[PDB]
Amino acid sequence: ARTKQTARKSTGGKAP
Amino acid sequence: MDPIPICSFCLGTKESNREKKPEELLSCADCGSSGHPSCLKFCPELTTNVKALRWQCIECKTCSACRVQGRNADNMLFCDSCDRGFHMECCDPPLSRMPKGMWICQVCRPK
Ligand SMILES: [Zn+2]
Ligand SMILES: [Zn+2]
Ligand SMILES: [Zn+2]
Ligand SMILES: [Zn+2]
């Protein structure tokens, strides 16, 4: 399953 | 809040995703942050499902059943069909083990 953690890493960071 | 016409991940508009190709944004209904589905890593049918719903981004997402984030918000499951978030203890029935692979929430399941 996808979690808030897996999704956050799956995308990588927001642009700084 | 009204959508920010820029993707939070690649800073492109709907006219230029990471491949410099046009692609409509998904926009968080709570904070207005947006992202290309390709940048969010959403599959096509998840994307078309999310487009028809009131979507929240990863950081705004509250559990659709109990409506809170709570201290363990990082282990909230996201529906592979609709991207709604559910705490494990709020699933139907409540889960004590993290599902491996595809998981689909109670809202998407048939009556
Ligand atoms: Zn993007
Ligand atoms: Zn948001
Ligand atoms: Zn909950
Ligand atoms: Zn769902």
Numbering used by the authors:
A (entry chain D): 1 to 16
B (entry chain A): 210 to 320
The article reads:
The MORF protein is a core catalytic subunit of the native complex which bears the same name (MORF) and has been implicated in acetylation of histone H3 and H4 5,6. The DPF module of MORF has been shown to bind histone H3 tail acylated at lysine 14 (H3K14acyl).
To gain insight into the molecular mechanism underlying recognition of crotonyllysine, we co-crystallized MORFDPF with H3K14cr peptide (residues 1–19 of H3) and refined the structure of the complex to 2.1 Å resolution. The structure of the MORFDPF-H3K14cr complex superimposes with the structures of the MOZDPF-H3K14cr32 and MORFDPF-H3K14bu14 complexes with RMSDs of 0.4 Å and 0.5 Å, respectively, indicating that the acyllysine-binding mechanism is in general conserved. In the structures, K14cr and K14bu occupy the same hydrophobic channel, formed by S217, F218, L235, S242, S243, G244, W264, C266 and I267 residues of MORFDPF, and are stabilized through a water-mediated hydrogen bond involving the side-chain amide nitrogen atom of acyllysine and the hydroxyl groups of S217 and S242. In addition to slowing an off rate due to ping-pong shuffling, the crotonyllysine-I267 contact aligned the crotonyl and F218 π systems for a more efficient π−π interaction. Indeed, replacement of F218 with alanine eliminated selectivity of MORFDPF toward H3K14cr.
